[PDB]
Design an enzyme around this catalytic site. Structure first.
Site, PDB file in Angstrom:
ATOM      1  CE1 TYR A 232      28.601  65.631  87.555  1.00 32.39           C
ATOM      2  CE2 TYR A 232      28.547  68.254  87.071  1.00 32.39           C
ATOM      3  CZ  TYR A 232      28.265  66.840  86.485  1.00 32.39           C
ATOM      4  OH  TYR A 232      28.105  66.432  85.603  1.00 32.39           O
TER       5      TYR A 232
ATOM      6  CG  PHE B  99      31.251  74.832  75.403  1.00 31.57           C
ATOM      7  CD1 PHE B  99      30.437  74.049  74.051  1.00 31.57           C
ATOM      8  CD2 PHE B  99      30.789  75.449  75.639  1.00 31.57           C
ATOM      9  CE1 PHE B  99      29.530  74.534  73.527  1.00 31.57           C
ATOM     10  CE2 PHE B  99      29.504  76.233  74.774  1.00 31.57           C
ATOM     11  CZ  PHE B  99      28.803  75.705  73.884  1.00 31.57           C
ATOM     12  CG  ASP B 100      29.052  68.170  77.093  1.00 30.01           C
ATOM     13  OD1 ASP B 100      30.177  67.425  76.035  1.00 30.01           O
ATOM     14  OD2 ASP B 100      28.292  67.365  78.044  1.00 30.01           O
TER      15      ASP B 100
ATOM     16  CE1 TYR C 219      23.856  66.830  76.575  1.00 29.07           C
ATOM     17  CE2 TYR C 219      25.395  68.508  77.662  1.00 29.07           C
ATOM     18  CZ  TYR C 219      24.971  67.463  77.325  1.00 29.07           C
ATOM     19  OH  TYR C 219      25.885  66.307  77.366  1.00 29.07           O
TER      20      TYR C 219
ATOM     21  CG  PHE D  29      23.883  72.881  81.346  1.00 26.49           C
ATOM     22  CD1 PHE D  29      23.685  73.236  82.673  1.00 26.49           C
ATOM     23  CD2 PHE D  29      23.631  71.667  80.606  1.00 26.49           C
ATOM     24  CE1 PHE D  29      24.748  71.795  82.733  1.00 26.49           C
ATOM     25  CE2 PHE D  29      24.709  70.666  81.437  1.00 26.49           C
ATOM     26  CZ  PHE D  29      25.106  70.696  82.696  1.00 26.49           C
TER      27      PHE D  29
HETATM   28  C1  LIG Z   1      22.135  61.541  89.647  1.00 24.92           C
HETATM   29  O1  LIG Z   1      23.217  62.434  89.912  1.00 24.92           O
HETATM   30  C2  LIG Z   1      24.589  61.939  88.343  1.00 24.92           C
HETATM   31  C3  LIG Z   1      23.734  61.383  87.719  1.00 24.92           C
HETATM   32  C4  LIG Z   1      24.625  61.095  86.852  1.00 24.92           C
HETATM   33  C5  LIG Z   1      26.342  61.709  86.607  1.00 24.92           C
HETATM   34  C6  LIG Z   1      27.296  61.716  85.709  1.00 24.92           C
HETATM   35  C7  LIG Z   1      27.135  62.961  84.177  1.00 24.92           C
HETATM   36  C8  LIG Z   1      26.601  63.278  83.574  1.00 24.92           C
HETATM   37  O2  LIG Z   1      26.689  64.613  83.444  1.00 24.92           O
HETATM   38  C9  LIG Z   1      25.255  65.300  83.869  1.00 24.92           C
HETATM   39  O3  LIG Z   1      23.700  65.252  84.799  1.00 24.92           O
HETATM   40  C10 LIG Z   1      24.974  66.617  82.606  1.00 24.92           C
HETATM   41  C11 LIG Z   1      24.001  67.395  82.700  1.00 24.92           C
HETATM   42  C12 LIG Z   1      23.743  66.596  81.336  1.00 24.92           C
HETATM   43  C13 LIG Z   1      24.633  66.635  80.175  1.00 24.92           C
HETATM   44  C14 LIG Z   1      25.836  66.710  80.989  1.00 24.92           C
HETATM   45  N1  LIG Z   1      25.673  66.941  82.335  1.00 24.92           N
HETATM   46  C15 LIG Z   1      27.351  67.490  82.050  1.00 24.92           C
HETATM   47  O4  LIG Z   1      27.660  67.489  83.927  1.00 24.92           O
HETATM   48  C16 LIG Z   1      28.257  67.628  80.573  1.00 24.92           C
HETATM   49  C17 LIG Z   1      28.979  66.533  81.518  1.00 24.92           C
HETATM   50  C18 LIG Z   1      29.529  66.270  82.382  1.00 24.92           C
HETATM   51  C19 LIG Z   1      29.950  64.427  82.999  1.00 24.92           C
HETATM   52  O5  LIG Z   1      30.923  63.456  83.234  1.00 24.92           O
HETATM   53  C20 LIG Z   1      30.897  64.215  84.680  1.00 24.92           C
HETATM   54  C21 LIG Z   1      30.060  63.538  81.318  1.00 24.92           C
HETATM   55  O6  LIG Z   1      30.328  62.509  81.422  1.00 24.92           O
HETATM   56  C22 LIG Z   1      31.861  62.432  80.818  1.00 24.92           C
HETATM   57  C23 LIG Z   1      29.779  64.133  80.044  1.00 24.92           C
HETATM   58  O7  LIG Z   1      29.964  63.681  78.823  1.00 24.92           O
HETATM   59  C24 LIG Z   1      29.017  64.102  77.777  1.00 24.92           C
HETATM   60  C25 LIG Z   1      29.175  65.404  80.439  1.00 24.92           C
HETATM   61  C26 LIG Z   1      29.212  68.707  82.046  1.00 24.92           C
HETATM   62  C27 LIG Z   1      30.693  69.013  80.630  1.00 24.92           C
HETATM   63  C28 LIG Z   1      31.453  69.842  81.094  1.00 24.92           C
HETATM   64  C29 LIG Z   1      30.651  71.005  80.985  1.00 24.92           C
HETATM   65  C30 LIG Z   1      29.205  71.274  82.035  1.00 24.92           C
HETATM   66  C31 LIG Z   1      28.819  70.114  82.020  1.00 24.92           C
HETATM   67  C32 LIG Z   1      26.116  62.636  82.999  1.00 24.92           C
HETATM   68  C33 LIG Z   1      26.340  63.007  82.035  1.00 24.92           C
HETATM   69  C34 LIG Z   1      26.264  61.818  80.250  1.00 24.92           C
HETATM   70  C35 LIG Z   1      25.083  61.454  80.339  1.00 24.92           C
HETATM   71  C36 LIG Z   1      23.953  61.235  81.295  1.00 24.92           C
HETATM   72  O8  LIG Z   1      22.613  60.658  81.511  1.00 24.92           O
HETATM   73  C37 LIG Z   1      23.077  60.194  79.811  1.00 24.92           C
HETATM   74  C38 LIG Z   1      23.543  59.226  79.853  1.00 24.92           C
HETATM   75  O9  LIG Z   1      23.915  58.410  80.966  1.00 24.92           O
HETATM   76  O10 LIG Z   1      23.556  58.564  78.774  1.00 24.92           O
HETATM   77  C39 LIG Z   1      24.415  62.013  82.550  1.00 24.92           C
HETATM   78  C40 LIG Z   1      26.882  62.657  87.440  1.00 24.92           C
HETATM   79  C41 LIG Z   1      25.817  62.307  88.829  1.00 24.92           C
HETATM   80  O11 LIG Z   1      26.196  63.170  90.122  1.00 24.92           O
HETATM   81  C42 LIG Z   1      27.601  64.227  90.260  1.00 24.92           C
END
Ligand SMILES: COc1ccc(CC[C@@H](OC(=O)[C@@H]2CCCCN2C(=O)[C@H](c2cc(OC)c(OC)c(OC)c2)C2CCCCC2)c2cccc(OCC(=O)O)c2)cc1OC
Length: 128
Positions: free
Chosen positions: A101, A55-56, A45, A118
């Site tokens: 969020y 960006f990520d 992704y 995404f």
């Molecule tokens: C059920 O609700 C939640 C569950 C999980 C989270 C944490 C953020 C959660 O992020 C997300 O759910 C979404 C969709 C999956 C990809 C990452 N993502 C994000 O928002 C991204 C994201 C967010 C992050 O933290 C908020 C990250 O951690 C530092 C992160 O690291 C790679 C990436 C955003 C980054 C900035 C630009 C916009 C995207 C997360 C991040 C990294 C890995 C994850 O699962 C696989 C693993 O753990 O290996 C899960 C927040 C939640 O609620 C706010």
């Protein structure tokens, strides 16, 4: 741009039909099956804030990005969106704050009331 196509042509995949998650299929996947709740899913992704400059990308990881679908391991929009994808599919998702969020944000990285975008490629899924 990709976000604009989603706004104007994207399908509303929300249960409530509130345009909180809008989807475009950019590449059709294989077969028929889409993953059930509890399945392990493997994706690549990239994602961004719709506003400003963050960006990520999964290609910066050294291991595959994996989560169990529908188990609250990712934001709500991903449990909704990935569930609709076939193996091999690439999709664009535009996501309102209520499915990400929210008003809280995830400060300082994610602001209050952030829309997200995404591109997701579903690599595989498996029963656990
Ligand atoms: C059920 O609700 C939640 C569950 C999980 C989270 C944490 C953020 C959660 O992020 C997300 O759910 C979404 C969709 C999956 C990809 C990452 N993502 C994000 O928002 C991204 C994201 C967010 C992050 O933290 C908020 C990250 O951690 C530092 C992160 O690291 C790679 C990436 C955003 C980054 C900035 C630009 C916009 C995207 C997360 C991040 C990294 C890995 C994850 O699962 C696989 C693993 O753990 O290996 C899960 C927040 C939640 O609620 C706010």
């Amino acid at each position: 741009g990709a976000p604009a196509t989603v706004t104007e042509q994207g399908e509303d995949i929300t249960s409530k039909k509130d345009r909180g998650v809008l989807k475009i299929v950019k590449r059709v996947g294989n077969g028929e099956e889409t993953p059930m709740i509890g399945d392990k899913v493997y994706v690549h992704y990239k994602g961004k804030l719709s506003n400003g400059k963050k960006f990520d990308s999964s290609h910066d990881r050294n291991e595959p990005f994996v989560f169990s679908l529908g188990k609250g391991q990712v934001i709500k929009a991903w449990d909704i969106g990935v569930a609709t994808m076939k193996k091999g599919e690439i999709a664009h998702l535009l996501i309102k704050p209520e499915y990400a969020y929210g008003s809280a944000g995830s400060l300082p990285k994610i602001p209050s009331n952030a829309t997200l975008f995404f591109e997701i490629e579903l690599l595989d899924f498996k029963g656990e």
